[PDB]
Amino acid sequence: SSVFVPDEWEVSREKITLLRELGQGSFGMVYEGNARDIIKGEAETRVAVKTVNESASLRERIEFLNEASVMKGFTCHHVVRLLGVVSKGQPTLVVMELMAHGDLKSYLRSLRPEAENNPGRPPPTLQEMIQMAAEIADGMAYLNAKKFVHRDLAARNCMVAHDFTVKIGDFGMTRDIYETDYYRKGGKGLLPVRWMAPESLKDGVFTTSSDMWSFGVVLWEITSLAEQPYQGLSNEQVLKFVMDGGYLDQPDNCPERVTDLMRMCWQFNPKMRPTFLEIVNLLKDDLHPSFPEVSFFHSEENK
């Protein structure tokens, strides 16, 4: 009987309760919910639950499959945690840790002084921006260490927790690079042009170096409160611009320290760009006391 070979990630639908919509993805919905007894020691746990639209295409379902699969293998404080999967029936539910403040792009925009949904606090201080950068870089370092390339690092894909900790999310485009250290894209597909390195736009080659290029754009989004990169240029113009050696300007009043990081990330030669561990190292002396207690960088696993 099938019962004798279960899936350890399987969660009973009975334990999940949906409260409200957190956001809408391209082929599904993300809901805030509460789950009963899904974590030892926790009677109830706040969660985010993603569903797949009944109308989702095969390509979209294949993507979600990879996404959930890669998440299962990750254990990092700075990477969004998968908690379980409800597959006993329809619709399939992917249960993840709740990131109360949603995606970084939305969060940043809400911090604009004139924002209708301003939470009543100032935009990110220099200290807060460095902390965000270090958390994103640590999560990315872990991913790189596990031999995966994200390919879609952007503020929209970083999530913010109740305590404002930023973590890497959206592993839909993530690829295994264990054997060769790179991924060469096959056919045609939807690519985040404004976040891509020149060599990826040119040859379709993705490496941890191209993820570093994207990290630089994320710093640009943080320092501009999520404005649109290359506003005024179409995707086709951006592709040509970047391949020709172009890059973004420093946002108005961008802290010199962050500007320096962006300069490192936007070098044309991927081999001259820094690594995620090197970014965390540059920032390690001015972070929250708890960082060494939870980071991949300070962990025994970073060997």
């Binding site: 952007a154 929209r156 045609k188 597909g189 939807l190 690519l191 985040p192 042009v193 404004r194 976040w195 995707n235 086709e236 592709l239």
Partner: peptide, 6 residues
């Protein structure tokens, strides 16, 4: 959008 089919 944020993506381009290419």
């Amino acid at each position: 959008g944020d993506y381009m089919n290419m």
